[PDB]
């Protein structure tokens, strides 16, 4: 009977034996949950023309947000962008006159949401 005893050391020391790391295909130009080299987040990915230095693995905003990243498998650079969001104001006359309303989606296009695109956002239900 051939026997192997694998004794594993779990100490307060850095690890040298590591398990396999799962991977998935890179979905681009879509709102997705992403995990790049342990960095977890939610957003869409786009192709970027930036040229990160080889050691650099992440991109940072004027504040602390990460804008760009390097894909581990394919060395192409991908820049991140927040999944769209905004307020939904309801444009209504007095209910004693009419119950008809128009909905304004602040600071968004008319694709993510009688449609009138304005600088304030995408207006739906109101005639131009």
């Amino acid at each position: 009977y051939r026997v192997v005893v694998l004794s594993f050391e779990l100490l307060h020391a850095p690890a040298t034996v590591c398990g396999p790391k799962k991977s998935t295909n890179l979905v681009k130009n879509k709102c997705v949950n992403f995990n790049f080299n342990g960095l977890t987040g939610t957003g869409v990915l786009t192709e970027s023309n930036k040229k990160f230095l080889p050691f650099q693995q992440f991109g940072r905003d004027i504040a602390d947000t990460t804008d760009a990243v390097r894909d581990p498998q394919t060395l192409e650079i991908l820049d991140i962008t927040p999944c769209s969001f905004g307020g939904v104001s309801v444009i209504t006359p007095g209910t004693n006159t009419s119950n008809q309303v128009a909905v304004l989606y602040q600071g968004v296009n008319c694709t993510e949401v009688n449609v009138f695109q304005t600088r304030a956002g995408c207006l739906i239900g109101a005639e131009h």
Binding site: K22, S23, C31, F34, P72
Partner: peptide, 11 residues
């Protein structure tokens, strides 16, 4: 806008 799928990329 909410996300529907998750992607994981490791070396």
């Amino acid at each position: 806008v909410q996300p529907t799928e998750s992607i994981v990329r490791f070396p």
